[PDB]
Amino acid sequence: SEVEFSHEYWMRHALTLAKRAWDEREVPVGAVLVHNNRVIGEGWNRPIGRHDPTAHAEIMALRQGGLVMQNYRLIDATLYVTLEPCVMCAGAMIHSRIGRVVFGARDAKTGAAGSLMDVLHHPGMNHRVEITEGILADECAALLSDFFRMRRQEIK
Amino acid sequence: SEVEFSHEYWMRHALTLAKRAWDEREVPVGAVLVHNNRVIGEGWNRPIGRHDPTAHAEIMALRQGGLVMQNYRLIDATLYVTLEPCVMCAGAMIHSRIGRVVFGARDAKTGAAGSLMDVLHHPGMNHRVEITEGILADECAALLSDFFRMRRQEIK
Ligand SMILES: [Zn+2]
Ligand SMILES: [Zn+2]
């Protein structure tokens, strides 16, 4: 079913992080940054609790990676995130120079890797980040679905 | 002649922050976030020294503003930055819901406020950030130019 170090194996770890966001009552998105099959950064969405509009899963994983690698450039790393990245995160991926982003569910309204727009393969960027899409898309989208319901199950 | 609280008055303050980046040998870009004419965030470019690819002046200013306002949404705030923002920072401004970005020099190669692409007024966004461009542009451009000149020298 899920071989060690395959995309699904790392995405499942990202889903463990997306659940931390779930517990903190934030949109459940998780991300893990991997280099040579070692975790060098982990993150979950938490803009509300951090009072920070930039606190997305991807930004958190990328900033930790920079610290772990002692380099703002994260050459050859692969960033796994449970939801297609937004424009901000796609831009951050370009500046980080990572090798690839692997995402789960598509974000139909604001995804920047094909959905709302494509930032990553736009011709004028100075670095091409490869894209793998739809890994465990169903579980990723169900987590989000369970959240937007259990959430309206709050608006009394 | 620069009236207190005018765009030029705030951009001149962002230029002082830009010189801090210069002093740290970082591309010289500075930013100041203002709400009701009071500083709620300040930033300068420091990705290299912070080992953080997301450490642009704008991101630093927005994060500080969020702390001060106790809210990731920075409604009606105005962000001054000495150089047209990149895709990542433009994306961040949209998530923060600021009212306006005022910038200095255009970034022809990779500006996301019209140069390389326009993220801010893309029609699929859920928030429109107003744009004021070119405030003290010549000064902002000279600082950047003097930098890439001084740097190209330093290469022994
Ligand atoms: Zn994002
Ligand atoms: Zn930027």
Side-chain angles (χ1 to χ4, degrees), chain A residues 21-43:
Chain A
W22 170 283
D23 295 343
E24 294 175 12
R25 301 183 53 62
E26 312 263 4
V27 180
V29 182
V32 54
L33 184 64
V34 182
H35 186 67
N36 294 328
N37 285 131
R38 275 256 315 117
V39 175
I40 69 294
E42 294 180 318

Side-chain angles (χ1 to χ4, degrees), chain A residues 56 58-59 85-89, chain B residues 95:
Chain A
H56 285 190
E58 304 95 307
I59 301 302
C86 67
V87 173
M88 177 181 67
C89 295
Chain B
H95 291 308

Side-chain angles (χ1 to χ4, degrees), chain B residues 8 15 23 27 39 50 69 76 80 96 101 117 129 139 142 154:
Chain B
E8 283 76 18
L15 279 164
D23 284 354
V27 176
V39 178
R50 294 176 64 173
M69 303 294 98
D76 301 316
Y80 293 83
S96 78
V101 54
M117 63 185 81
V129 175
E139 283 182 70
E154 300 186 299

